[PDB]
DNA sequence: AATAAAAGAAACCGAAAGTAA
DNA sequence: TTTACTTTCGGTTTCTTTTAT
């Protein structure tokens, strides 16, 4: 009934967001760019695109109707990632203090029994 | 299965020690205790707690051991509905304990 | 149905400050609705109404159950939503002021 | 120093599934 | 079965305290 799992899998499977790539061929671990908005390498378009995309895809942000607030978009996805049972951050694999920094996440498989 | 069987039958089930938690509260035998546990709770075991409901289903024609598939929720609902509408029984709702372990309801027997 | 009468009764008492009628026909009322994280929020006064609903239904027992104001708030909110006896006037609600509240109109039968 | 972004935790929401009477 | 709430689901928004430039 949720949308985050399928949606994010789709954005990675698309080549739309550079740095949003699978790390393995088994499609279980992926990399998600996570740049601090204050950095010099940061451009609003390319780095905020994934967060804006989630706000567009849910009804939250409507282009031309609403005033843009990019930190809000990032907070939504971060908190959504944290809370979801579908995603587990591999905190020992995240690279946040480099140019082109990223976080590493695992998509949990569904459970065996009921 | 027919009319005028509920009152005496339940009195008989209380006077026997067969159903744990189905005991009299007074010596005048006008008020009694009936376990009323949610089937999902952890303490719930199907045998002991569904026994009274299964017993009513057997005593009336509704359940036949070995011929029909058991449905404990159906037995509970059937006996519940009988108690509410019964002129022979009146719930003392101010003494019932439904949000405790081994929860129960308290009922008063209407004299004629 | 106990909510319709119970809530009408809670408004008619002056017990909960901010739980007041807006009109003289007793069809529309104001129900305080503050976020529990805000600074003005005090646990006793603002959760009192939700606490009262939890008491009046069997859900909370003083001294037997651990207090959970967030669950109290959720139950009352969801109850109002499903109620055919209650309809929120969303064009009147004031959620982003100090002392925020919601506005509800009582459906006549 | 200052301004802006960011962080976890928890309270929060509607919708729907669930439960009881 | 209808009415009437209550609980659960899948994220979302807020609160307060760090972190980045």
The domain locations on chain B are: 1-112
Sequence length of chain C is 109
Q: Are B35 and B22 in contact (CB under 8 A)?
A: yes
Residues of chain C whose C-beta is under 8 A from some C-beta in B?
A: 58-59, 61, 64-65
Q: B107 forms bridges with which residues in the sheet?
A: B32, B91
Backbone angles phi, psi at B31, to 5 degrees: -125, 140
Please tell me whether any atom of strand E lies within 7 Å of the Cβ of A5: yes
- C-beta of residue B36 within 8 angstroms of C-beta of residue B53: no
What is the spatial distance, in angstroms and rounded to an integer, between the CA atom of B37 and the C1' atom of D17? 21
A80: region left, alpha or beta (phi > 0 left; psi from -120 to 50 alpha): alpha
Torsion of CA C44, C49, C50, C56, to 10 degrees: 120
Are C and B touching by the rule of 3+ CB pairs within 8 Å?
yes
Q: How far is the CA of B6 from the C1' of E6 (A)?
A: 32
List of chain C residues whose C-beta atoms are within 8 Å of the C-beta of residue B98 = 58
Contacts of C58 in chain B (CB under 8 A): 98-99
Please, what is the Cα angle at B71 between B61 and A114, to 5 degrees? 170
E strand map for C8-96: 20-21, 28-32, 86-88
| Minimal CA separation from B45 to chain C, in Å | 24
- Helix intervals (H) in chain A: 4-13, 44-57, 70-83
Give the separation between CA A92 and CA A103, rounded to whole angstroms. Answer: 10
Q: How many Cα atoms occupy the beta-carbon half-sphere of C11 within 13 Å?
A: 22
Instruction: Give the span between the Cα atoms of A82 and A85, in whole angstroms.
Output: 8
Tokens matching residue C52:
């009262």
Give the angle C41-C46-C49 at the CA atoms, nearest 5°: 165
Calculate how close chain C gets to B100, using CA atoms only, in Å: 9
Cβ-Cβ contacts under 8 Å for A106 (sequence gap 6 or more): A28, A29, A87, A88, A89, A90
| Chain B: partners with 3+ C-beta pairs within 8 Å | C
Q: In a 10 Å sphere around its CB, with 0-12 CB exposed, 13-18 middle and 19+ buried, how is residue C40 labelled?
A: exposed
Q: Which two tokens stand for residue A70?
A: 């990019």
CA separation, residue A18 to residues A21, A22, A72, C80 (Å): 7, 11, 21, 46
Angle at C70 between CA C69 and CA C71, to 5 degrees: 90
DSSP structure class, residue B24: B
């Amino acid at each position: 009934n949720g949308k985050l799992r399928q949606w994010l899998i789709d954005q990675i499977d698309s080549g739309k967001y550079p740095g949003l790539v699978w790390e393995n061929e088994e499609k279980s671990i992926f990399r998600i760019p996570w740049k601090h908005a204050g950095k010099q390498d940061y451009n609003r378009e390319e780095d905020a695109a994934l967060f804006k995309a989630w706000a567009l895809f849910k009804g939250k942000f409507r282009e031309g109707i609403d005033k843009p607030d990019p930190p809000t978009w990032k907070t939504r996805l971060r908190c959504a990632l944290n809370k979801s049972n579908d995603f587990e951050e591999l905190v020992e694999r995240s690279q946040l203090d480099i140019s082109d920094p990223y976080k590493v996440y695992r998509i949990v498989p569904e459970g065996a029994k009921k």
